[PDB]
Design an enzyme around this catalytic site. Structure first.
Site, PDB file in Angstrom:
ATOM      1  N   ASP A  35     137.791  33.379  50.317  1.00 31.37           N
ATOM      2  CA  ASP A  35     136.765  32.353  50.183  1.00 31.37           C
ATOM      3  C   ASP A  35     135.652  32.491  51.223  1.00 31.37           C
ATOM      4  O   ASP A  35     135.820  32.103  52.376  1.00 31.37           O
ATOM      5  CB  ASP A  35     137.423  30.976  50.299  1.00 31.37           C
ATOM      6  CG  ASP A  35     136.467  29.838  50.020  1.00 31.37           C
ATOM      7  OD1 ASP A  35     135.337  30.094  49.554  1.00 31.37           O
ATOM      8  OD2 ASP A  35     136.855  28.678  50.267  1.00 31.37           O
ATOM      9  N   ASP A 221     129.178  32.742  47.678  1.00 33.27           N
ATOM     10  CA  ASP A 221     130.477  32.076  47.764  1.00 33.27           C
ATOM     11  C   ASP A 221     131.499  32.591  46.750  1.00 33.27           C
ATOM     12  O   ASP A 221     131.439  32.254  45.569  1.00 33.27           O
ATOM     13  CB  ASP A 221     130.294  30.560  47.607  1.00 33.27           C
ATOM     14  CG  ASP A 221     131.589  29.787  47.788  1.00 33.27           C
ATOM     15  OD1 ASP A 221     132.603  30.399  48.180  1.00 33.27           O
ATOM     16  OD2 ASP A 221     131.592  28.561  47.541  1.00 33.27           O
TER      17      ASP A 221
HETATM   18  C1  LIG Z   1     133.137  25.485  47.053  1.00 36.84           C
HETATM   19  N1  LIG Z   1     134.482  25.703  47.564  1.00 36.84           N
HETATM   20  C2  LIG Z   1     135.477  24.765  47.557  1.00 36.84           C
HETATM   21  O1  LIG Z   1     135.425  23.624  47.118  1.00 36.84           O
HETATM   22  C3  LIG Z   1     136.711  25.429  48.182  1.00 36.84           C
HETATM   23  C4  LIG Z   1     137.144  24.704  49.468  1.00 36.84           C
HETATM   24  C5  LIG Z   1     136.923  23.325  49.633  1.00 36.84           C
HETATM   25  C6  LIG Z   1     137.317  22.662  50.799  1.00 36.84           C
HETATM   26  C7  LIG Z   1     137.941  23.365  51.827  1.00 36.84           C
HETATM   27  O2  LIG Z   1     138.372  22.841  53.015  1.00 36.84           O
HETATM   28  C8  LIG Z   1     137.429  22.756  54.072  1.00 36.84           C
HETATM   29  F1  LIG Z   1     136.519  21.807  53.753  1.00 36.84           F
HETATM   30  F2  LIG Z   1     138.025  22.405  55.232  1.00 36.84           F
HETATM   31  F3  LIG Z   1     136.769  23.921  54.234  1.00 36.84           F
HETATM   32  C9  LIG Z   1     138.167  24.735  51.676  1.00 36.84           C
HETATM   33  C10 LIG Z   1     137.775  25.397  50.510  1.00 36.84           C
HETATM   34  C11 LIG Z   1     137.854  25.486  47.166  1.00 36.84           C
HETATM   35  C12 LIG Z   1     139.054  24.776  47.307  1.00 36.84           C
HETATM   36  C13 LIG Z   1     140.044  24.881  46.333  1.00 36.84           C
HETATM   37  C14 LIG Z   1     139.837  25.690  45.220  1.00 36.84           C
HETATM   38  F4  LIG Z   1     140.811  25.760  44.305  1.00 36.84           F
HETATM   39  C15 LIG Z   1     138.654  26.417  45.037  1.00 36.84           C
HETATM   40  C16 LIG Z   1     138.416  27.274  43.870  1.00 36.84           C
HETATM   41  C17 LIG Z   1     138.580  26.850  42.557  1.00 36.84           C
HETATM   42  N2  LIG Z   1     138.366  27.627  41.471  1.00 36.84           N
HETATM   43  C18 LIG Z   1     137.967  28.883  41.735  1.00 36.84           C
HETATM   44  N3  LIG Z   1     137.767  29.425  42.948  1.00 36.84           N
HETATM   45  C19 LIG Z   1     138.001  28.596  43.988  1.00 36.84           C
HETATM   46  C20 LIG Z   1     137.673  26.296  46.029  1.00 36.84           C
HETATM   47  N4  LIG Z   1     136.213  26.817  48.450  1.00 36.84           N
HETATM   48  C21 LIG Z   1     134.952  26.849  48.126  1.00 36.84           C
HETATM   49  N5  LIG Z   1     134.124  27.916  48.340  1.00 36.84           N
END
Ligand SMILES: CN1C(=O)[C@@](c2ccc(OC(F)(F)F)cc2)(c2ccc(F)c(-c3cncnc3)c2)N=C1N
Length: 366
Positions: A35, A221
């Protein structure tokens, strides 16, 4: 060697790409979402209906508690600590990294995605709970001799569908791309923020003030499936796409990324949908280069329209990256794009990376 890193990514269409990692001693094997849109190493660490495995801190002789909790609505909650981490099909090193052990969450994990944690590869500025929690890649570079760079080749599916790709840590694998690598500057080290200076649909300029394309920001992203565009840009884009594919139209539930559209077994009229060109600011102020994506990319598998509206700026997600070999050159604050050796394309069009294009103020300040 990078050869051992090739094809180290797997996933389900629309559910993200993951890499195998081990945490703790003895090594606990987990699948972790790659990610570039976040900066925490956060792993399921308690039973959950969608988790078949999770990180068990008590099983690790090398786990160290930081006595500090974390609450992240956006949600998930957990306890901060450190442990030894390795990537079996990455560099041959072991690093002590921060780990957010997720004990509770809501709408965070995905049913059947086959990953149990997230590897946030972005910068400390957006780490939770604050920027003092050193992100994984920072720990990796500081603790080892690995070059401050990684690259991603996301390959999608091609003919839920299974996807594959490669994450090359510490360098560039020339077997993964063809032609030239073009670099766009990393505007600020928080997200992987970049600047889009122009976009065209089938060679037709959308003719918008370029600030609109980066309002309020543009990021690369891997943790977002779609190409997400600011409201005004999205509307202009759909209109142009609708017109180009006017020959037999579709329901608007489709254009909203809700309803799917279906043909059967290689009858899909790809040639009816236009190509989309995103022009990224070059290393030279008045220069740019374009990455051109095909319907094969923005229609993801029956297909769903993989372009959607955003209220938080442009997001160049998986479907955009899937056309290209993407180099996250942290050492030189730049992101490189080249045509991927794996990208899908027909016999009339191919994804492209082309420059330079010169102009005669596109950033949305902060
Ligand atoms: C946009 N995005 C998300 O919402 C997140 C995410 C959100 C909050 C977070 O915790 C913090 F905030 F501490 F960083 C960390 C990451 C995310 C979270 C869960 C997911 F299943 C997906 C996802 C879903 N389907 C396809 N591919 C990725 C993305 N990763 C991205 N880039």
């Amino acid at each position: 060697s990078f050869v051992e890193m090739v094809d180290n990514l797997r996933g389900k269409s629309g559910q993200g790409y993951y890499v195998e990692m081990t945490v703790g001693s003895p090594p606990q094997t987990l699948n972790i979402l790659v990610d570039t849109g976040s900066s925490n190493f956060a792993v399921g660490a308690a039973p959950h209906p969608f988790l078949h495995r999770y990180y068990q801190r008590q099983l690790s002789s090398t786990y160290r508690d930081l006595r500090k909790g974390v609450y992240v609505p956006y949600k998930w909650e957990g306890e901060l600590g450190t442990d030894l981490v390795s990537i079996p099909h990455g560099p041959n090193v072991t690093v002590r990294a921060n780990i957010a052990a997720i004990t509770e969450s809501d709408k965070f994990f995905i049913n059947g995605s086959n990953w149990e944690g997230i590897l946030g590869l972005a910068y400390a500025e957006i780490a939770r709970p604050d920027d003092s929690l050193e992100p994984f890649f920072d720990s990796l570079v500081k603790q080892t001799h690995v070059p401050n760079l990684f690259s991603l080749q996301l390959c999608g599916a091609g003919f839920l569908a299974s996807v594959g790709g490669s994450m090359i840590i510490g360098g560039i694998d020339h077997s993964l791309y063809t032609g030239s690598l073009w670099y766009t500057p990393i505007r600020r080290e928080w997200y992987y923020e970049v600047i889009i200076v122009r976009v065209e649909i089938n060679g037709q300029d959308l003719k918008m003030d370029c600030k609109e394309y980066n309002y309020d920001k543009s990021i690369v992203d891997s943790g977002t499936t779609n190409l997400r565009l600011p409201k005004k840009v999205f509307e202009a884009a759909v209109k142009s796409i609708k017109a180009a594919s006017s020959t037999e139209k579709f329901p608007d539930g489709f254009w909203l990324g809700e309803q799917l559209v279906c043909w059967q077994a290689g009858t899909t009229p790809w040639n009816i949908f236009p190509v989309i060109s995103l022009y990224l600011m070059g290393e030279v102020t008045n220069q740019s280069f374009r990455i051109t994506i095909l319907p094969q990319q923005y229609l993801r598998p029956c297909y769903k329209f993989a372009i959607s509206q955003s209220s938080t700026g442009t997001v160049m997600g998986a479907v955009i990256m899937e056309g290209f070999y993407v180099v996250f050159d942290r050492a030189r604050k730049r992101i490189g794009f080249a045509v991927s050796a794996c990208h899908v394309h027909d016999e009339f069009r191919t994804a492209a990376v082309e420059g330079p294009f010169v102009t005669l103020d596109c950033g949305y300040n902060i």
